[PDB]
């Protein structure tokens, strides 16, 4: 994994290093005698550590240190400056210049390979750390979005974006079971857009669906409690469950849903020439009692209320308690 | 786990003076905490509790061998990877070689000036921090990647594979066929298609049950997948008892040749059936069509049409036979 790039004008020092990194596998070596090519050599072999001689003819090791730190290609490679006359004034200045280590020309072979490996691993760990951090951010972003999408396809109505039929009915069933234990009121609204069939085959589908999308927008705005839930049972049929809600409160939301839906003023000629889209709403409510009683009985009640509503003129609200 | 720049230095020296001199250089930098320990006996325990990013260890201490204490750091799991800068008194360049072998990562002659000190303190801590973060990222990465692979595998079976036969399902086949069609328009090559239906299958399913019907299907499927062996060939279960086979760069002669291998090898499976009369076997009606896409309004759909027609005519001319699309 290691690749040592040594820079020094002394052809012998370059050898004392080569002959110590020899009996050491996993660590490539490279020797450069001409400082004028050092920067070049560095942008090619891509070392994991650079041993840079401080004093050479024509260029000092610190102006080369500024070169290695000039391009991304090598700006992160750790460098060990090698000195001859150990002058703690230049030493101090080397570190200030960013030098990562300082060695009085060639120490014990055991130490020289220990520093070479420690720096290389550090260099690679930083490389792999950022790389990982980046790939990780992508992965989690991907996974989060993928799950959002699958969730939506799983429990939501495509057009309306509201919950689908089975998601809703399963919630209704679990809410019924909990209202049975807590002996509380469970209200349900069955919402049908009036004369929608008539409307659909006279304005097309894109107009029908566009209207159903709008009505759905007035339906979710009707309930706001975290435990409240609205659905598009299918076609122009919607549903809303309101845990812990009383007949009166349920009635309020129904009426509020009806009113806001009408204030959309979606033109339609069936109720007669100059009217607009409206909805009939059946409202039911109960406190689950023991014995038989399934949530299906609450639904039968809402449907009856819905039927009564339609047969009394539509665009109004029907209630039922038993 | 440790956040970026969270430097924690642990100095283990017996001389409280050396401690104080450092316990200052590191007060002018809040982005780095400090902790001094004078008892070698607790050095490891202390490091285990404060969790340092770098430790400065005194090589010579009373009643404790220095090079052995280092080895003790490499033996504790939580400190094994912590960089150690050994502090030498008055110098000794012999202990030095031994120190690095023992696990030392850096060598300092008792307290250099705050500049070289912190450079090394931060260089080593950053290094330790990086390694710790790399492994936490690598771990969370494989976890995330696995979750995605698992999901992708589920979607593949659902989207382009048929559970029972293990063959390609219909949308995958249709998609592939369309691509082959377009490629054939470009290369002006012949594209053949076979539509394969098991004869009297329903009849067989209500008489022998799903268990047996499914196994019959699994068998036909196998005889079909063997009728074509080119890397670009593709066999698919097209429906209930309906299958399909698309053969790129195949002439009408080749297509009907392979059509017959199927009919033949299916009938030789000899899956007893009481239809169309006692003592029968499950046979296959096949429809073959082949075309060279010719430009203008004509898609891969026409190729499917033609094979369906040949299959209709084959089913109506007695079954257990090959029907060939008539050319005007
Ligand atoms: N006008 C009106 N608006 C309603 C009603 N029910 C729900 N909302 C709307 O829905 C938001 C969230 O309701 P939540 O999920 O029950 O979450 C609620 C609930 O858990 C709690 N909370 C607030 N007010 C009451 C209260 O009077 N009784 C109870 N039991 N909890 C309350 O605080 C949360 C947030 O409250 P908000 O900030 O007000 O935000 C409320 C409010 O804007 C209602 O009966 N009348
Ligand atoms: N399931 C459900 N039912 C709804 C919602 N909004 C209204 N209701 C029903 O309508 C009744 C009166 O609502 P309100 O006029 O807004 O008058 C409300 C409101 O002024 C206040 N209130 C209760 N909960 C909240 C809340 O979460 N946020 C705020 N801001 N006010 C609340 O208390 C009054 C009476 O509350 P309740 O006794 O609960 O009786 C409520 C409830 O049965 C809703 O989003 N979900
Ligand atoms: N143009 C051309 N290419 C040739 C010919 N013979 C071999 N190849 C190439 O060699 C691959 C492997 O050939 P294989 O070992 O005979 O193994 C073959 C062979 O066992 C079988 N196969 C495919 N087509 C025919 C055929 O027309 N007759 C027979 N008897 N076997 C076939 O499928 C295997 C893999 O088929 P491929 O995926 O297409 O992959 C083929 C194909 O790319 C040839 O006469 N003409
Ligand atoms: N798509 C597809 N078509 C098939 C396959 N097996 C047979 N055919 C069709 O049947 C024709 C004659 O096949 P053959 O009797 O094996 O006679 C073959 C065979 O002896 C030899 N040949 C061609 N390709 C291969 C190959 O990949 N492997 C071997 N072993 N022989 C090959 O060339 C003869 C004529 O080849 P073609 O001109 O291509 O004409 C072929 C081809 O149109 C198959 O696995 N996939
Ligand atoms: Mg020199
Ligand atoms: Mg001491």
Six-digit token pair at A228? 């409240």
Classified as helix, coil or strand, B242 is strand
Token pair for residue A284? 């039911």
Cα(B276) to ligand 2 centroid in Å equals 71
State the CB neighbour count (10 A cutoff) for residue B54.
Answer: 26
Distances, alpha carbon A301 to alpha carbons A176, A234, A281, A307, in Å: 14, 19, 12, 10
Burial class for A134, CB neighbours closer than 10 Å (0-12, 13-18, 19+): exposed
Distance (Å, whole) CA B180 – CA B188: 11
Radius of gyration for chain B, computed over Cα atoms and rounded to the nearest angstrom: 39
Considering Cα of B315, then B316, then B320, then B322, what sign does the dihedral take? negative
Burial environment of residue B77 by CB neighbours within 10 A (0 to 12, 13 to 18, 19 or more): exposed
Q: Which atom of ligand 3 is nearest to the CA of B231?
A: 38
Backbone angles phi, psi at B9, to 5 degrees: -110, 135
Is B260 near ligand 4, meaning CB less than 6 Å away?
Answer: no
> Distance between CA B75 and CA B224 in Å, rounded?
63
CA angle centred on A252, ends A248 and A258, rounded to 5°: 140
Pick B100's closest partner by Cβ from A114, A129, A133: A114
**Count of A-B CB contacts under 8 Å:** 70
Contacts of B297 by beta carbon, 8 Å cutoff, 6+ apart: none
Residue A5 near residue A28, CB atoms below 8 Å:
no
The total number of residues written for chain B in this structure: 328
The verdict on whether residue B14 carries a ligand-binding annotation is yes
Which residue, judged by its Cα, is nearest atom 42 of ligand 1? A224
Beta pairing partners, B198: B284
Angle, CA B277 vertex, CA B275 and CA B282 arms, to 5° = 35
Task: Please report which residue ranges of chain B form alpha helices under DSSP H.
Answer: 16-25, 40-50, 66-75, 95-102, 114-160, 170-187, 201-226, 252-267, 300-315
Crossing angle (nearest 10°) for helices B66-75 and B40-50: 30
d(CA A105, CA A56): 13
Which stretch of DSSP H or E encloses residue B326? none
Q: CA neighbours within 13 Å on the CB side: how many for A217? A: 9
Burial A232-248, CB ≥16 within 10 A → b, else e:
bbeebbbbbbbbbbebe
Please provide the distance, in angstroms rounded to a whole number, between the alpha carbons at the two ends of chain A: 80
Phi, psi of A220 (to 5 degrees): -75, -25
Domain boundaries, chain A: 1-136, 137-322
Main-chain dihedrals φ then ψ at residue B229, nearest 5 degrees: -125, 10
Phi, psi of A35 (to 5 degrees): -55, -25
Angle between helices A61-68 and A88-96 (to 10 degrees): 10
Q: Which CATH superfamily is domain A1-136 in?
A: Response regulator (3.40.50.2300)
Phi, psi of A66 (to 5 degrees): -75, -25
Tell which residues of chain B come right before a gap with C–N over 2.5 A.
none
Instruction: Name the β-bridge partners of B192.
Output: B247, B290
Tokens of B96: 């030095």
Within 10 angstroms of residue A45's Cβ, the number of other Cβ atoms is 12
Largest distance between two CA atoms of chain B:
108
CA distance A77 to A134: 20
How far apart, in whole angstroms, are the C-alpha atoms of residue B289 and residue B326?
Answer: 9
Method by which this entry was solved: X-ray
Query: Looking at CA atoms only, how far is residue A89 from chain B in angstroms?
Result: 11
Q: Please indicate whether, in this complex, the C-beta atoms of B119 and A95 are within 8 angstroms of each other.
A: yes
Residue A256, Cβ density class (10 Å: 0-12 exposed, 13-18 middle, ≥19 buried): middle
Q: Using the mean position of ligand 2's atoms as its centre, give its distance from the Cα of residue A223 in Å.
A: 10
Residue A257 main-chain phi, psi, to 5 deg: -70, -45
C-alpha dihedral (B59, B60, B66, B72), degrees to nearest 10: -80
Rounded to 5 degrees, φ, ψ at A213 are -70, -45
d(CA B97, CA A268): 93
Structure tokens at A56: 């050479």
Residue B191's φ and ψ, nearest 5 degrees, are: -120, 115
How many whole angstroms separate alpha carbon B124 and alpha carbon B130? 10
| Element spanning B109, H or E | strand B106-109
Q: Is B308 helix (H, G, I), strand (E, B) or coil?
A: helix
Q: Is the peptide bond before B276 cis (omega within 30 degrees of 0)?
A: yes
Of A300, A283, A173, A175, the closest CA to residue A225 belongs to A175
User: In which order are the strands placed within the sheet that holds B234-237?
Assistant: B234-237, B242-248, B191-198, B284-291, B322-324
Contacts of B146 (CB under 8 A, 6+ apart): none
Out of A91, A128, A139, whose CB is closest to B134?
A128
In this complex, do B116 and A92 lie within 8 Å of one another by their Cβ atoms? yes
Task: Output the CA angle A70-A75-A76, nearest 5 degrees.
Answer: 170
Please, which residues have CB within 8 angstroms of residue A26's CB and are 6 or more apart in sequence? Answer: A1, A2
The response to whether A173 counts as a known ligand-binding position is no
Could you tell me if B198 and B164 are in contact, meaning their C-beta atoms sit under 8 angstroms apart?
Answer: no
User: B224: helix, coil or strand?
Assistant: helix
User: Which token pair is A221?
Assistant: 């705005």
Give residues with Cβ within 8 angstroms of A70, minimum separation 6.
Answer: none
Distance CA B138, CA A136 (A): 8
How far apart are the CA of A191 and the centre of ligand 2, in A? 20
Q: CATH: 3.40.50.1860, 3.40.50.300, 1.10.15.40, 3.40.50.2300. Which one for B1-143?
A: 3.40.50.2300
3-state secondary structure chain A: CEEEEEECCCCCHHHHHHCCCCCCCCEEEEEECCHHHHHHHHHHHCCCEEEEECECCCCEHHHHHHHHCCCCCCCCCCEEEEECCCCHHHHHHHHHCCCCEEEECCCCHHHHHHHHHHHHHHHHHHHHHHHHHHHHHHHHHHHHHHHHHHHHHHHECCCCCCECHHHHHHHHHHHHHHHHHHCCCEEEEEEEECCHHHHHHHHCHHHHHHHHHHHHHHHHCCCCCCCCEEEEEECCEEEEEEECCCHHHHHHHHHHHHHHHHCCCCEECCCCCCEECCEEEEEEEECCCCCCCCCHHHHHHHHHHHHHHHCCCCCCEEEECC
Nearest to A129 among B100, B133, B147 (CB): B133
Chain A interface disruption, residue of B103, B122, B147, most A CBs within 10 A? B147
Beta-bridge partners for A241: A188, A229
Distance between CA atoms of residues B301 and A201, nearest Å? 31
Angle at B107 between CA B104 and CA B110, to 5 degrees: 125
Q: At what angle do helices B66-75 and B95-102 cross, to 10 degrees?
A: 10
Q: Is B50's C-beta closer than 6 angstroms to any atom of ligand 4? A: no
Could you tell me whether strands B234-237 and B242-248 are parallel, antiparallel, or unpaired per DSSP bridges?
Answer: antiparallel
Task: With H, G, I as helix, E, B as strand and everything else as coil, classify residue B21.
Answer: helix
**DSSP H or E segment with residue B286:** strand B284-291
Separation of alpha carbons A243 and A177, rounded Å: 11
End-to-end CA gap in chain B: 75
- Give the Å distance between the CA of A297 and the centre of ligand 1: 29
Nearest CA to ligand 4 atom 41: B254
Cα separation, A56 vs A8, in Å, equals 7
- C-alpha B130/C-alpha B132 separation (Å) is 5
The CATH architecture that domain A137-322 belongs to is 2-Layer Sandwich (3.30)
- Give the separation between CA B250 and CA B234, rounded to whole angstroms: 13
- Rounded CA-CA distance B244/B195 in Å is 5
Paired tokens of A5: 């790039």
Structural class in CATH, domain B144-328: alpha beta
Quote the CA–CA distance of B120 and A115 in Å, as a whole number: 13
């Amino acid at each position: 994994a290691v690749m040592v790039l040594l820079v020094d004008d002394q052809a012998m020092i370059g050898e004392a290093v080569r002959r110590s990194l020899a009996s050491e596998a996993g660590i490539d070596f490279h020797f450069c005698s001409d400082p004028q090519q050092a920067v070049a050599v560095a942008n090619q072999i891509k070392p994991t550590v650079i041993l840079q001689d401080l004093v050479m003819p024509g260029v000092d090791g610190l102006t080369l240190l500024a070169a290695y730190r000039g391009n991304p290609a090598t700006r992160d490679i750790p460098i060990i400056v090698l000195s001859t006359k150990e002058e703690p004034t230049v030493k101090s200045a080397a570190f200030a210049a960013g030098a990562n280590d300082y060695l009085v020309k060639l120490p014990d072979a055991i130490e020289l390979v220990a520093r070479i490996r420690y720096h290389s691993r550090s260099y690679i760990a930083l490389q792999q750390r950022d790389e990982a951090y980046r790939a990780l951010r992508e992965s989690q972003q991907q996974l989060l979005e993928t799950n959002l999408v699958l969730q939506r396809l799983m429990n939501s109505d495509g057009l309306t974006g509201l919950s689908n039929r089975r998601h809703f009915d399963e919630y209704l069933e679990m809410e019924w079971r909990r209202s049975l234990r807590e002996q509380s009121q469970l209200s349900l609204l069955m919402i049908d857009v009036d004369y929608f069939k008539s409307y659909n085959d006279t304005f097309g589908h894109v107009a029908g669906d566009e209207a159903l999308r709008q009505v759905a927008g007035a339906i979710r705005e009707g309930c706001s409690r975290s435990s409240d839930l609205a659905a598009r049972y299918g076609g122009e049929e919607f549903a809303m469950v309101l845990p812990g809600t009383s007949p009166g409160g349920a009635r309020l939301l129904a009426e509020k849903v009806r009113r806001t839906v009408e204030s959309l003023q979606i033109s339609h000629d069936q109720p007669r020439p100059g009217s607009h889209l409206t909805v009939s709403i059946g409202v039911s409510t109960l406190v689950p009692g023991g014995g038989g009683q399934t949530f299906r009985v609450l639904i039968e009640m809402a449907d009856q209320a819905l039927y009564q509503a339609k047969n009394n003129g539509r665009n109004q609200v029907g209630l039922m308690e038993q």
